[PDB]
Design a protein around this ligand. Structure first.
Ligand SMILES: CC(=O)N[C@@H]1[C@@H](O)[C@@H](O)[C@@H](CO)O[C@H]1O
Ligand SMILES: CC(=O)N[C@@H]1[C@@H](O)[C@@H](O)[C@@H](CO)O[C@H]1O
Length: 130
């Protein structure tokens, strides 16, 4: 489909599958934006259900643990269905739960959690076409 970056309003860094790792359970972190073929682990698309998937391996965003990680999409696991909702990345079944850069950590490599929406910039994202 059409690919995009999910770019933090906090620091302009983008969501990134850490180390371009194709394995389940790879952490999704913030990282400086890359362009070209190597950017595949920073590129995302929405499936037929509007659910976000990685260009790398078609994995979903998973929020089953304290930090977010990649997992194969399963439509029966509510914590693997994340959608674009304005400038937030929201849980399909609960739009008030959103992706959140933990403790507003501005450094590269920062981890992301699911948290209730509170309007802080650490929960705000710009969708940028590839
Ligand atoms: C091309 C590539 O692999 N780059 C990744 C980078 O995107 C980021 O995930 C970083 C985290 O330390 O690891 C690097 O290996
Ligand atoms: C208002 C605010 O930014 N609160 C943050 C929250 O968004 C989340 O990142 C959490 C991680 O434990 O840390 C809190 O300090």
């Amino acid at each position: 489909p059409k690919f995009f970056y999910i770019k933090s309003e906090l620091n302009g860094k983008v969501l990134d599958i850490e180390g371009q790792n194709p394995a389940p359970g790879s952490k999704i972190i913030t990282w400086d934006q890359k362009k070209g073929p190597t950017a595949v682990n920073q590129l995302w698309y929405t499936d037929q259900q509007g659910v976000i998937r990685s260009k790398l391996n078609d994995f979903a965003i998973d929020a089953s643990h304290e930090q977010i990680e990649t997992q194969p999409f399963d439509p029966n696991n509510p914590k693997r269905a994340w959608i674009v909702s304005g400038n937030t990345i929201a849980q399909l079944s609960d739009r008030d739960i959103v992706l959140d850069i933990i403790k507003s950590d501005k450094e590269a490599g920062a981890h992301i959690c699911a948290w209730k929406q509170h309007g802080g910039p650490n929960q705000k994202f710009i969708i940028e076409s590839e």
